[PDB]
Predict the structure of Flagellin.
Amino acid sequence: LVAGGGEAATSTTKLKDISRFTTDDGVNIFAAGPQELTIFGNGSSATIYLEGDDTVSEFETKLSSAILELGMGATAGTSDEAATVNSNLVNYVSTGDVTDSSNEALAGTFVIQTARLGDDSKLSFIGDQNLINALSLATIQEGENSETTIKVTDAHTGKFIGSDSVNDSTLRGVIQGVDVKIDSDVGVSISWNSTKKT
Amino acid sequence: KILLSTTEAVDTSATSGGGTIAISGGPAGTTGAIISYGNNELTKVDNGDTTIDYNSVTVYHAALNVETGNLDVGNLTFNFREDTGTDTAYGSTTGGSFDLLVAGGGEAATSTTKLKDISRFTTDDGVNIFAAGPQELTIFGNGSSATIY
Amino acid sequence: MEFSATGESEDIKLHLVDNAMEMQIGANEGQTILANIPQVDTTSLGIDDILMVDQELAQESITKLDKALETVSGVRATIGAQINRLEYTMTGLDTTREN
Amino acid sequence: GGDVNETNVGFVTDPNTLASTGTAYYTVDVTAGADTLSSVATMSVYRQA
Amino acid sequence: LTAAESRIRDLDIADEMAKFTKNQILAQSNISMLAQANSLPQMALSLLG
Amino acid sequence: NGVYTTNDRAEIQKEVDQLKEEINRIASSTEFNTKKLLNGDSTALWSSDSSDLDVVIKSAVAEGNYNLNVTVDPGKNFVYKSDVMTLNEDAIGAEIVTA
Amino acid sequence: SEKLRGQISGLKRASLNAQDGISLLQTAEGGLQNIQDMLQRMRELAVQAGNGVYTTNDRAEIQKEVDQLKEEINRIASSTEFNTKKLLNGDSTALWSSD
Amino acid sequence: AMYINTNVPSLTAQRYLGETNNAVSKSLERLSSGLRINSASDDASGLAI
């Protein structure tokens, strides 16, 4: 199927041709040279370089690898579940792959998700004003925190000491003078549903 | 103490689907046990491109020390091939042998761990105590004292 | 004209070592400060092949000049951050000395 | 030691308390089906004095 | 734009002059106190001795 | 105040990071007679086996070894969408489409 | 007393070392300021040319002085010095070579 | 308690005089130059704008 210009872009279109990557004066961003993009998350940062000749699929692959470098991706479950989850992190929807009443109900858009819960899943983007404005990111879902049930008992006799149900996973006020922090990647299993794409 | 290994009898001759794993070697030169798997339990099937695949299998191994006889138990996870299979029947697998090297122990202290690798034996400034040289320890009791290096 | 691939790949070798700057900032083995200064010249700024002969290169020239200016500003402000940290850390040494 | 990958193992993860010093190499035979029998072999013994 | 840029040029000189005056006034008091502090101890103790 | 682009804020972040490093150093460098004061060495002393548990000391703690049991109820994450991208006036695109 | 006197001596040494360090950064900042000053005149003379009233000789007249300015900026890039240790020419971070 | 060569107040005065002198010098430099930012360390965001 040959789709002309003036229409949804395809998977092999070069980045120097998209309409959103030219200014009002007709000078594309990639004229001077390759562009930077910095991503902040999980108390870390990463930097990628874009050149005006790569296609969209290369952009998706680079973004997926950069995100997985931060460690936000699937943990060392090391199963095919992890491979599929890693591959379905950044998605591009073509004309022949639209699904009604789903996150991907719009044609030719990038969908971005992460593999952690709550505030840990917030991403921040830094770059040139024109590039950031051209990307025009938007939010369709916001994160929520978890509920942790904690019980404490002695290690030699087993006498009960205390229990709590917390939200930020910080055990406070049960052991005298000590606060304990427990990570949020404990006791969770992740799966991927392609029938609904979630 | 006496330490033994035990083996089970399996058919291991199906249309396809699995294989057997055998761990051997080590500083004690042990010849460990052999285990067998079932059908479609090592390699999965293609889904167009598969974007490269890997399956996971967990293995536990135990060793015995010769002077205190304290047992050490460790685990590993093998990742097996992307996607095999006959003409949409059951799967496929490849046999052979290769060599493996280890570094560190994991998240615990093993019986044969080197004393310069314990995280508790370094200060907050990044310098380890033993870098300068040997240390002295004194024990007092019952009106007597002793010193060790 | 016809250009063709040679057909035999080429091999190159590169040697790289570090020459960073150390700063002793304490009275015991271990506490220090590291210092580095990025290499800056015409080649680093990427304006080696700027040309002014015809009425077509000035626009690219202006773009490249903007990029070089923002890079130099970033470097200078990094140096400023370093100097501010050192100024703040100088006085605690004398306070501890008095105590 | 010298041997080429005749099998289809990608890599190994999660090494945890599997002893250490990594010098006496390990043999991880992956055989593709062979009849197995019931048997026993003495692994080790330990005496103090 | 040149009005906008000429808002980070320099402070209204009056505040700078005030800071300078206060600092210059306080310096002399520091000097006098340091002189008396140096004077006191040797003299007093050698008087005791 | 929004008059700054998304680069000035990263520039500020660099200096903020340096100040954080300095405060960490001064927290971890205090000393008297080989006795570190502020580094939690004056009240208690803790250690655990897991690599995902953090402990902060506030006041006097009692003693002993404890066993903890955890149960989890999950939440949700953030989902972002980018905008529609189209072609220019002179572009040609091809795709493999099924019907 | 021995431990305290040793620590005091170390403190004095670090106190001197701090200012000894700060001087170098001040010098580098001055040099970078001069470079930044030149680049802006380069930009203004760049936006100068680009008008069509001028023949191909006026642009050559501009080009000669632009080349001279580039040579001067290269000289100032390669001329900075402190105690027989060049700063800006990548001799403070790394060292590379190839055949 | 009277001692010999233990003049801690002299050290305190020396330190305070140090801050006073540095502040005076910086104020003099700013006034002579007639510019707010100067150098590169007074403000990190004004330079780019």
